[PDB]
Design a protein around this motif. Structure first.
Motif, PDB file in Angstrom:
ATOM      1  N   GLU A 109       9.771   6.990 -15.291  1.00  0.00           N
ATOM      2  CA  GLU A 109       8.978   7.882 -16.099  1.00  0.00           C
ATOM      3  C   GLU A 109       7.798   7.097 -16.683  1.00  0.00           C
ATOM      4  OE1 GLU A 109      10.924   9.708 -19.400  1.00  0.00           O
ATOM      5  OE2 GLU A 109       9.253  10.952 -19.815  1.00  0.00           O
ATOM      6  N   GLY A 110       6.602   7.608 -16.463  1.00  0.00           N
ATOM      7  CA  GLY A 110       5.394   6.927 -16.884  1.00  0.00           C
ATOM      8  C   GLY A 110       4.795   5.975 -15.860  1.00  0.00           C
ATOM      9  N   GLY A 111       5.384   5.934 -14.681  1.00  0.00           N
ATOM     10  CA  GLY A 111       4.939   5.018 -13.670  1.00  0.00           C
ATOM     11  C   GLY A 111       5.443   3.621 -13.869  1.00  0.00           C
ATOM     12  N   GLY A 112       4.828   2.687 -13.169  1.00  0.00           N
ATOM     13  CA  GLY A 112       5.185   1.292 -13.271  1.00  0.00           C
ATOM     14  C   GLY A 112       6.483   0.813 -12.665  1.00  0.00           C
ATOM     15  N   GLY A 113       7.098   1.622 -11.829  1.00  0.00           N
ATOM     16  CA  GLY A 113       8.327   1.218 -11.184  1.00  0.00           C
ATOM     17  C   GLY A 113       8.096   0.048 -10.252  1.00  0.00           C
ATOM     18  N   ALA A 114       9.099  -0.799 -10.143  1.00  0.00           N
ATOM     19  CA  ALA A 114       9.031  -1.904  -9.231  1.00  0.00           C
ATOM     20  C   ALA A 114       8.990  -1.364  -7.807  1.00  0.00           C
ATOM     21  CB  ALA A 114      10.224  -2.814  -9.417  1.00  0.00           C
ATOM     22  N   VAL A 115       8.491  -2.162  -6.900  1.00  0.00           N
ATOM     23  CA  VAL A 115       8.187  -1.675  -5.532  1.00  0.00           C
ATOM     24  C   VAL A 115       8.781  -2.553  -4.463  1.00  0.00           C
ATOM     25  CG1 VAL A 115       6.029  -0.753  -6.363  1.00  0.00           C
ATOM     26  CG2 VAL A 115       6.004  -2.936  -5.181  1.00  0.00           C
ATOM     27  N   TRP A 116       8.993  -1.968  -3.291  1.00  0.00           N
ATOM     28  CA  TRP A 116       9.494  -2.718  -2.155  1.00  0.00           C
ATOM     29  C   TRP A 116       8.550  -3.876  -1.887  1.00  0.00           C
ATOM     30  CZ3 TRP A 116      11.765   0.097   2.670  1.00  0.00           C
ATOM     31  CH2 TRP A 116      12.654   1.076   2.273  1.00  0.00           C
ATOM     32  N   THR A 117       9.129  -5.046  -1.779  1.00  0.00           N
ATOM     33  CA  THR A 117       8.403  -6.303  -1.620  1.00  0.00           C
ATOM     34  C   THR A 117       9.101  -7.136  -0.546  1.00  0.00           C
ATOM     35  OG1 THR A 117       7.889  -6.262  -3.991  1.00  0.00           O
ATOM     36  CG2 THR A 117       7.447  -8.265  -2.829  1.00  0.00           C
ATOM     37  N   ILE A 118       8.410  -7.350   0.554  1.00  0.00           N
ATOM     38  CA  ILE A 118       8.996  -7.893   1.753  1.00  0.00           C
ATOM     39  C   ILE A 118       8.736  -9.381   1.761  1.00  0.00           C
ATOM     40  CG2 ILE A 118       8.883  -7.965   4.272  1.00  0.00           C
ATOM     41  CD1 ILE A 118       8.709  -4.843   2.208  1.00  0.00           C
ATOM     42  N   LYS A 119       9.795 -10.166   1.671  1.00  0.00           N
ATOM     43  CA  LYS A 119       9.688 -11.606   1.472  1.00  0.00           C
ATOM     44  C   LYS A 119      10.752 -12.315   2.252  1.00  0.00           C
ATOM     45  CE  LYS A 119      10.113 -11.300  -3.368  1.00  0.00           C
ATOM     46  NZ  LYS A 119      10.344 -11.718  -4.805  1.00  0.00           N
ATOM     47  N   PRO A 120      10.437 -13.496   2.775  1.00  0.00           N
ATOM     48  CA  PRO A 120      11.523 -14.334   3.284  1.00  0.00           C
ATOM     49  C   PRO A 120      12.467 -14.781   2.190  1.00  0.00           C
ATOM     50  CG  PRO A 120       9.448 -15.216   4.101  1.00  0.00           C
ATOM     51  CD  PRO A 120       9.108 -14.271   2.993  1.00  0.00           C
ATOM     52  N   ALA A 121      13.745 -14.716   2.462  1.00  0.00           N
ATOM     53  CA  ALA A 121      14.730 -15.087   1.479  1.00  0.00           C
ATOM     54  C   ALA A 121      14.823 -16.592   1.370  1.00  0.00           C
ATOM     55  CB  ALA A 121      16.077 -14.503   1.836  1.00  0.00           C
TER      56      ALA A 121
END
Length: 153
Positions: A109-121
């Motif tokens: 709510e209000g935006g700012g949600g975390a997002v899919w982030t594609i990274k080597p582990a």
């Protein structure tokens, strides 16, 4: 094209050149979700194919090979879970303003949600999906949806 491909179960989810795979657990004990692996190889039949559909004010993201939904884990990662949970399986899909790239975001709510982030582990891979704060210039957050009988057949 700035259009999200809904109800097209042959859709690939891309970051860059890599596409997303998911496999059903082979574990015996209770499992909390399987990794979403980005690469240019597919581990099993339909493991790279996804179905996106509306869900309330957002979207649900389903893998045709693993029978799992992409889900918010309790550890700031995105995992495939074997049962739908509306509290973890709903995503906001927001157009980035560029090309055909989107951000896939935790509903907030209000935006700012975390997002899919594609990274080597690790230096040895694999490359998987994290939930990090949005950085609008980060290529690792840009998702594209490649439709069957358009980009590939």
């Amino acid at each position: 094209a700035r259009k999200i491909p809904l109800d097209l179960p042959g859709t690939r989810i891309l970051n860059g050149a890599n596409w997303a795979n998911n496999s059903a657990t082979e574990n015996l004990a209770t499992n909390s979700g399987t990794l979403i692996i980005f690469d240019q190889s597919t581990p099993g039949q339909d493991a790279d194919r996804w179905l996106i559909h509306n869900y309330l004010d957002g979207y649900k993201i389903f893998n045709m090979g693993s029978n799992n939904w992409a889900s918010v884990s309790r550890g700031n990662t995105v995992l495939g879970v074997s049962e739908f949970d509306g509290q973890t399986c709903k995503w906001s899909i927001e157009y980035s303003g560029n090309g055909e790239e989107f951000w896939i975001r935790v509903p907030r709510e209000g935006g700012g949600g975390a997002v899919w982030t594609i990274k080597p582990a690790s230096s040895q891979g694999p490359t998987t999906v994290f939930l990090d704060l949005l950085k609008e210039t980060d290529p690792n957050q840009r998702i594209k949806f490649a439709v069957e009988n358009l980009y590939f057949q």
